[PDB]
Amino acid sequence: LIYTAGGYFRQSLSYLEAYNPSDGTWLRLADLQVPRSGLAGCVVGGLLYAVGGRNNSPDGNTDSSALDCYNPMTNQWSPCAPMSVPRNRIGVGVIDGHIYAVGGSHGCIHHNSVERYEPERDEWHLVAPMLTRRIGVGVAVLNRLLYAVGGFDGTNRLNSAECYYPERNEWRMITAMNTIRSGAGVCVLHNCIYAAGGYDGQDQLNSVERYDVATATWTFVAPMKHRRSALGITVHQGRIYVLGGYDGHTFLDSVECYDPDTDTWSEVTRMTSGRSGVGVAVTMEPSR
């Protein structure tokens, strides 16, 4: 199952919905404890983690440092220890069962900080900061290395990408993308880092480009059918899924799937309601 948590459409949502690519169905599950947009989702030990984001309530607007975990066996949410700072429009990646929270904003502060979460101790430790302040950053893990791609620094939208070495504890710059992208969807498929969509300060983008480590190069692939930024992205059974996003006029509910063997995109499903800024991950389906 593909899970989408949170999101945004006129305000921040607490929806938690799971998609079945063979059923067609969307499952409504336990709402997030607090409505949140601009968050990230990941899966460690089967549990679905929802990280950071912001609560845009009609009453107030607060960036979040919260970490919350969802259990598909219990269909229940449980809070974890929070990060050191609120991180809206965050990126996250998993390395050896540890959650890396990357960038994001807190009010006017644009983070370059990065922190690591250890699920076995429910603890958060700060690691080496990034070379760039990046909110709306895409994050991926390839061969146990953490990559931070694109983003916005508060003044400029970025096309650069950097790599973090966990044991070396430092970041080093890599080849920049062909396109400046903030709020793109970044994932790993096979051994290539995919950057899809995003916003370049002027247009929402449908272009997709993938980074090959062996040649240290970003090459363009088949573009999506719909430009979108602040989209959700995940990989399921060797195919990429992008969910939602914002195209400058509407909050999309389109869900596109990319088949790498044919370099093509297809529209498989719509979400129950358009939204952007979701967390998205894949884990076992819940329990009847």
Tokens found for residue 29: 């599950």
Q: Cα angle vertex 194, ends 126, 5, to 5°?
A: 60
Which structural domain, as residue segments, surrounds residue 138? 1-288
Beta strand 47-51 with 40-44: parallel, antiparallel or unpaired?
antiparallel
> Do residues 215 and 203 lie in contact, with contact meaning Cβ atoms separated by under 8 Å?
no
- The vertex-54 CA angle with 48 and 58, nearest 5°, equals 125
Measured distance CA(268)–CA(205) in Å, rounded? 20
The experimental technique behind this entry is X-ray
Name the residue among 163, 37, 181, 152 with its Cα closest to residue 95.
163
Alpha-carbon distance of 108 to 85, in angstroms, equals: 13
C-alpha closest to that of 88 among 34, 51, 127, 49: 51
128 CB-side CA count, 13 A = 15
Total count of residues recorded for the chain? 288
Q: Cα separation of 256 and 274, whole Å?
A: 13
Residue 287 burial (10 A CB sphere; 0-12, 13-18, 19+): exposed
Q: Is 237 exposed, middle or buried (0-12, 13-18, 19+ CB in 10 A)?
A: exposed
Beta strands in 87-207 (DSSP E): 91-95, 98-102, 105-106, 109-110, 114-118, 123-126, 138-142, 145-152, 157-165, 170-173, 185-189, 192-196
Domain count, the chain: 1
- In terms of phi and psi (left: phi > 0; alpha: psi -120 to 50; beta: otherwise), the region of 151 is left
Residue 188: which residues within 8 A CB-CB, separation 6 or more?
A: 140, 141, 142, 194, 235
- Bridge partners of residue 91, in order along the sequence: 102
Q: Assess contact for 91 and 48: CB atoms under 8 A.
A: no
- The vertex-202 CA angle with 198 and 203, nearest 5°, equals 50
CA–chain centroid gap for 249, Å, is 22
Spatial CA neighbour of 265 closest among 283, 237, 238, 239: 239
